[PDB]
Structure 1
C-alpha cells in the first residue's frame, strides 16, 4: 500500500539551504545542547529545569505546549513523570511527530549524563523548531491539515531491570491517554479524504523517534516495512547531501552511509512500542549497533562526535522540510 501523503522531492534550492551549516547555526545548536548535558534523573531538580527549558523554548516560538504529568508506581516507589508535547498547529488533523526521551538513566555506578541517550536528540528537536521557525510559521497558515508535533517523553528508562512494567512510563501513559481520547475528522482541520480518525492517536501520521544519537558513524536500517516510503526519503536526502558535498567528512572523497538501504533483524524496545501496538507508523532513528558508550558513565559530552551531529542535523532539517514542503 502506498503512503497516504504524496511525498514531493525537495527542490535543489531547498536541499542546498537545509544542507548549509553556518557558524551561528553551530553555535546555536551547541548553546541548546549545553542545557541538556546535565544529569536528568526522574523527579530531580535538574530534570525539572530541563523540562522548563523545553517548555519555555517552544512557547517562545508560539507553539502549543502541553505538560502531561502523572504519578506512576516503579520498583523505586511512586514517581512523578511529565511528558512534554509541543504542537505547531493544534487544529491540523495530521501530525508529523518527532520524538525522544528527556529523562536520564539512574546509573548504579554514579553520575550519568546520557549525552547520546538522549541529550543530543532533545537538542536536535529544539534546534529543528528554532532553525526552521520562519518556515514552520509560514506552513501553519496553509490550512493543509498537516503540522509538526514534538514529544519529549519522560520515564523511558528502567529504574531496575528493563521489563514491560519497568520502562517506557511516559510513552505507555501518553499512548493510552491519546487512544482513549475520542475524536473524528468532522472535528478537525483538513483530514486526508480516506482517513480513519476515531481518537487522538490516529492523528499521529508517523512517529519518527530519535534515540542514541551523537556518536560517530551510526548505522540505521528500516525497522518497519510499513514506513519504508518515509525511511527511503532519509536515504535519498543523505545521498543528495553527499552528492552536493555538504557532509562533513575527515578526508576528501568520502561519503556518509548512515541510512542503510536495507532492513535488519533487530528488535529494539523504546518509546515507540506503545504507539506501534496502537497502529501508529514508526520510523525508529536509533543506531544498530548501539554506541559503545551505551549505558556507561562514558556517555558524556566529550565522547560526542560533532561532525556527525552536524551531518544528522542537515538530514533532519531537509527531511522535515521535504515532508512539510517548507
Structure 2
C-alpha cells in the first residue's frame, strides 16, 4: 500500500549541499582507519572498535546503548555486544541504519573485511558526524521521527554458516526488542494509524548496509514492502548524476548502482530476524558480492574510493530527504 510517511522530495538546494564532498574525504578516511583492523569476536581489537563506536556517538550527544550477552557458538561460549545509538530516544518512529562491526574469523589468515563491513561502519559514523548540526536541529521538532544506528555483533559464522551459527547479535536484538512491550501512549508523536505493541514496531524501516566499498556495486529492490523507499535511492542517485556531483572515470558517464528493477535473490544477513517480525527492510548489499568477498584480499587497497564518495553522497541525501533535514 502507501508508505506510512509521505516522502517529500529533497529541494534542489538541499540535494546540492548533500552532494558536496570537501577535508570531508579526509574526515571519512580517518574514521575508516579505526575499522581497518581485524575485529574477531572475543578479541581485544573488537573491544576497541566497539569502544570507538560508542565514544564517537556519545561525543555527538546520542543516546548509546549496548546489548551485551554471551552465546554458545561452535567455538564455545562467546561475548557479543550490539551497539545501538538513538538520536532522539523518545521519538516514536526510527529510521534505522545498520551494519555489523565484527569480522570473519578466517582460517587462512588475518582478515580485515574492508567492505565487510569496515566501510559501512565508517559510513554510519560519518553520516552522524557530517549531519550532526542538522540532526541536532531535527531532534527539537517534536515530529515523532528520529535516526537510529545499529552496529550488530556476531553477524559472521564461526564455522559453516547455519541458522544456529550466524547472526548472533541480530537474532538476539530482534528477540529482545520484540518482547519489550510498549504502546503509542508511552511515546512521542506516533503517526495516526500506528500499531505499536513493542520496540520492534518503532523501527519504521531498517536500511542494512553490507559489503560496500568495491567498485561498481549493483543494488536491486529486494522487498516489495520497501519499494517506495528504494525508489528514493534510485531518484537521489539520478539527480546527483544530473547535477554532475558523481565521481566517474570519464566525463559523461553516470553511476547506476541502484537498479530500477528487482531481483529474485535471497541473501541471509542481519535483516532476517527483523523481517520475520515484519520490519520493512532496504538491503543495501551488492549483487554479485565483491570479488574479494571472504578472501584475504578484502583489505584497504582493494577499496574504490570514488565509489565510496559517491555512496556517501547518496546516503547523506537520502537521510536528509527522509528526516527532512
Give the Cα separation in 2 of the matches to 1:250 and 1:176: 45
Residues 218-238 of structure 1 deviation map (CA, whole Å, 9 limit, x = unaligned): 000000000000000000000
Distance 2:6 2:42 in 1: 43
Q: Secondary structure at the match of 1:259?
A: coil
Secondary structure of residue in 2 paired with 1:221: coil
Distance 2:137 2:26 in 1: 25
| Residue 265 of structure 1, CA deviation | 1.1
Cα separation, 2, equivalents of 1:6 and 1:194: 13
- CA distance in structure 2 between the partners assigned to 1:149 and 1:249 by the alignment: 31
Residues of 1 paired with 2:279 and 2:20: CA distance?
Answer: 32
CA distance in 2 between counterparts of 1:183 and 1:2 reads 25
CA shift for structure 1 position 131: 0.1
Q: Measure, in 2, the Cα distance between the counterparts of 1:257 and 1:13.
A: 22
Deviation per residue, 1:240-283 (Å, 9 max, x gap) = 00000000001011000000000001100000000000000000
State the match for 1:139 in structure 2.
138
| Alignment TM-score, normalising by the size of structure 1 | 1.00
SS of residue paired to 1:129: helix
Partner SS state of residue 79, structure 2: strand
Map 1:71-150 onto structure 2 (within 5 A).
Answer: 71-150=70-149
Q: CA deviation at 1:13?
A: 0.4
Tell me by how many angstroms 1:149 deviates: 0.1
Could you tell me how far apart the structure 1 residues matched to 2:42 and 2:20 are?
39
Equivalent-residue separation in structure 1 for 2:39 and 2:210 (angstroms): 16
> Which 4+ runs in 1 deviate beyond 4 A?
none
SS at match of 1:237: helix
The answer to whether the aligner puts 1:18 opposite 2:18 as a matched pair is: yes
Stretches of structure 1 that go unaligned for 5 or more consecutive residues are none
Where does residue 295 of structure 1 map in the other structure?
294
- Partner Cα distance (2:199, 2:250) in 1: 48
SS of residue matched to 1:141: coil
Shift of 1:108: 1.1
CA distance in 1, matches of 2:169, 2:21: 34
Q: Distance in 2 between the 1:235 and 1:255 partners? A: 12
The C-alpha deviation readout for 1:71-104, integer Å capped at 9, x for no partner, is 0000000000000000000000000000000000
Q: When the two structures are aligned, how many residues end up with a matched partner?
A: 325
- Distance (whole Å) between structure 2 residues aligned to residue 184 and residue 226 of structure 1: 23
**CA distance in 1 between partners of 2:21 and 2:249 (Å):** 16
TM, length-normalised to structure 2: 1.00
